[PDB]
Amino acid sequence: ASMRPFAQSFDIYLTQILRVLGENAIAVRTKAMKCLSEVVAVDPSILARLDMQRGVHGRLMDNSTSVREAAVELLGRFVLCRPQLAEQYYDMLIERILDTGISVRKRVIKILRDICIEQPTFPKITEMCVKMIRRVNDEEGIKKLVNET
DNA sequence: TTTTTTTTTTTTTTTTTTTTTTTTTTTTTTTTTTTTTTTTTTT
Numbered sequence: 001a002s003m004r005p006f007a008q009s010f011d012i013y014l015t016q017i018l019r020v021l022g023e024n025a026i027a028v029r030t031k032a033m034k035c036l037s038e039v040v041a042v043d044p045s046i047l048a049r050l051d052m053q054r055g056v057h058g059r060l061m062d063n064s065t066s067v068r069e070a071a072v073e074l075l076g077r078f079v080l081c082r083p084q085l086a087e088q089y090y091d092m093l094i095e096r097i098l099d100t101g102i103s104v105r106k107r108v109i110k111i112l113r114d115i116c117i118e119q120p121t122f123p124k125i126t127e128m129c130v131k132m133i134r135r136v137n138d139e140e141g142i143k144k145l146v147n148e149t
Numbered sequence: 150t151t152t153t154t155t156t157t158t159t160t161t162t163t164t165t166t167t168t169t170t171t172t173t174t175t176t177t178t179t180t181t182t183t184t185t186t187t188t189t190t191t192t
Contacts, residue, residue: 026165066164103163141162 014039014052021055029067033059037074044081060092065101072096072104076111083119090124097131105135105142113149 001007020032036056040046047053060071075093079086096108112128136146 064165069164101164106163 014049018051018055021059026064026066029059029062029064030070033067033070033074037070037077040074041077041081044078047078057092060096065099065103068096068099068101069103069107072107072111076107080111080114080118087123094124094128094131097135102139102142105138106145109135109142109145109149 017032017036021029023029036052047056056071056074059067060075062068062071072093075089079089079093093108093111096104099105099108109132112132115122116125116128132146132149136143
């Protein structure tokens, strides 16, 4: 089988999915992001190819809250999985608290809570606590989440 | 009869897409007015 022209298809598949990410329908881009996130969380040493990098950055800055929360969910699961090597994505993550949705804020707060529980002695604990306390008055559901956390 | 994990069902939250609905002039109609037009009365 490893001689046959099927085992060397996975590469192709990624490329195909990444052609999709620039398109003009929201649901399709959301699903592309979720499927890519699942792929990434299976084989965590795939956030290396430069095209995937530029893809997830672009979609992190995208103009619709659905794909934004999808992208931040990918990045958060990747950070939680690999304990170290996250000091490079923390800045682009913690930029996203101020993101004018209610999805993205809740997702970033959940990811931050799991960080602050799982691997203490991380350097940026104080700033994380300051920002989460800062958002205590922002909304209602978010308020409940921060209060119980 | 009453407790527990696993599974099953409900329900709850939050976005995106469609849907009735309010408004915003524009035009039409109809009744009110009033000015002119028409019609006897009288000094």
